[PDB]
Ligand binder design. Sequence first.
Ligand SMILES: O=c1[nH]c(-c2cccc(NS(=O)(=O)Cc3ccccc3)c2)cs1
Length: 124
Amino acid sequence: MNPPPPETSNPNKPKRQTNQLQYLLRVVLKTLWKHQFAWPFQQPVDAVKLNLPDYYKIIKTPMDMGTIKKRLENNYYWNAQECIQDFNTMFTNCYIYNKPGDDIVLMAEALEKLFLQKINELPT
Ligand SMILES: O=c1[nH]c(-c2cccc(NS(=O)(=O)Cc3ccccc3)c2)cs1
């Protein structure tokens, strides 16, 4: 069973746009999205579709790149660090739910390396 997906808007939360957040959408996310290993991470985990009935028994802070993309498009984040934390949650969730060496983990590990390469330098 699937919980509601994470919010992509919140009227109580202040919005912001920064050069670094623009870069996270235009360069970082949109490049990762095109990687051959991006597909499992482009939408929230669908536990019914994927037959993972224990996914949300284990993962209590789900995150995916579809959600991150919508948040960036919404100017949902206050700063780049907040967005970077969502990417890190996404990767960590994968390592938590699975086992070292699993195919899905190899995919997340490759994306994480590419992500780190791209966020090493952000615009000023
Ligand atoms: O811990 C995690 N497992 C997954 C996972 C595992 C097995 C299969 C899938 N398939 S899927 O991405 O939902 C289906 C899909 C297939 C093609 C394009 C976009 C999505 C995801 C994402 S995070």
